[PDB]
Amino acid sequence: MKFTVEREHLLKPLQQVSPILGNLLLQVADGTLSLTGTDLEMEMVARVALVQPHEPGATTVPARKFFDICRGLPEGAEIAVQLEGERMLVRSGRSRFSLSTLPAADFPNLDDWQSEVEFTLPQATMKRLIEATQFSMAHQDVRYYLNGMLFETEGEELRTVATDGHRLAVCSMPIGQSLPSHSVIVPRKGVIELMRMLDNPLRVQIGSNNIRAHVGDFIFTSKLVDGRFPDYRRVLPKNPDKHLEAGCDLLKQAFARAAILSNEKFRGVRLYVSENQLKITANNPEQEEAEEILDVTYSGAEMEIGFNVSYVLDVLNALKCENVRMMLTDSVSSVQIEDAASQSAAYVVMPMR
Template sequence: MKFIIEREQFLKPIQLVIGAIERRHNLPILANMLLKVSQNALTLIGTDMEVELVGQVSLTQTAVDGSTTVPAKKLLDIVRSLPDRSQITAEQKNNQIILSCGRSRFALATLPVVDYPHFDHWVADVEFGIAASQVRCLVNATQFAMANQDVRYYLNGLLFETKDNGLRVVATDGHRLATCAVALDGNMPEHRFILPRKGVLELMRLLEDSDELIQFALNRDTLSVKTASMMLTCKLIDGSFPD
């Protein structure tokens, strides 16, 4: 695997994808980020096995296909330390990836891609599009009432409800309750799901500067949110939210 990329192009998806990677972990592979080059595009994947973030960047220069996993925090620190508008060359050699930029050279140990966990293939029951600004409005109006580390695990997240032509979000910690709703185009099947706290936080990071139309896809266990260049996949909380 080999690719050449501008620092800013590389840094932004690393900063987003690393949000899924826990600093405290029992499996060494979970401290790593997966890098994959295929058809002149670079894909970056991070996961803690509950939340997965995937970013993709088009490569303007000819690249060599391949994949590996690298320590995410070290990769972020290196790329962030390099000069603005600099060009980075990344090349996989044996059990290392070599990052070169000007006179600087860094070597990171890699772990096999085959050991990297992935979400199993799943089929969506409900799909819909919504403006990123609407999602931010819904979450900003409700997340303050979301519980944190409550023994009633189903309160440690936001309830999303689709019905008729609307989407409603509800949060409660047992003492206070917040709700907010927006209209959607077309009639929606009735569906309820609880997005856990980490999924909520990563969703807001993903949509922070976005005004685009995003795509939601979900079934009873899993949610994915897709933008033009990123995708968040998250396991949902299996529980009954109080009425």
């Protein structure tokens, strides 16, 4: 196995694919160097065209070390690689490295599988879908499926849903292709890696137990998560006909200040809603108190309601909105929150006692 490639053609591939699970599989075959990384749950494969003389073969080398060596070399460096016995030699200028290897034959593969559902979409649309909902995924819930993210196709829409039982996020985007009605749950790490590959359209293939994403010369494949993901349609309030609208940054900063004097564990704040006014209060066991009064647009009935302020702040930070709409039902029911100018994402938060 031999190849010579420009540093700059290796960096992003090495970054994307980065005992044998600590190694990268390198394969020179036909006109291409393939680099694969895996943790047994997911894998990333990068293809790099070899325009300089090369010789076929395969090995595995330590991922971090190989990446650090390449990125540590100067801009414009040419990197010559060749397998010598059981070592992999890396040479560039008068820099030389000899890395340990493990046999390519030992590198693990995911089980073979068939594509059942397929669609293409812009990278920007996938970024939007993930960033809109990722923060609402559970962390270490015994309901393992809540620790990942639902990807649902319905009509011509792709939708993401994330929830931890206390708050929920849902985002739907049109992708202009007739889709089957189908849903899958992508594990947390898979969502992270899928986001990290978005710098070229994205081609997605979904099987019974796997999802695959093709972007440029990268292919990401992940196992899916088993389980019954809750239906967001049963979580959206049926008729939250009290509508308050407010500036997103103004509201966020008021909540952020009140939060300072909220209970450190339970983070409770109280909202008092009245004609074109919102009052936010907070208190803690030290009997310290915060109060914020804000002008809003509200012409519904007066009510009060309590929330974990972190969940509300999380939503406002995700929206990056100009104005926000809060849609209320009563003091003991969830609230729905949206960008005042877009229905494409919605957020549901439980009240506190």
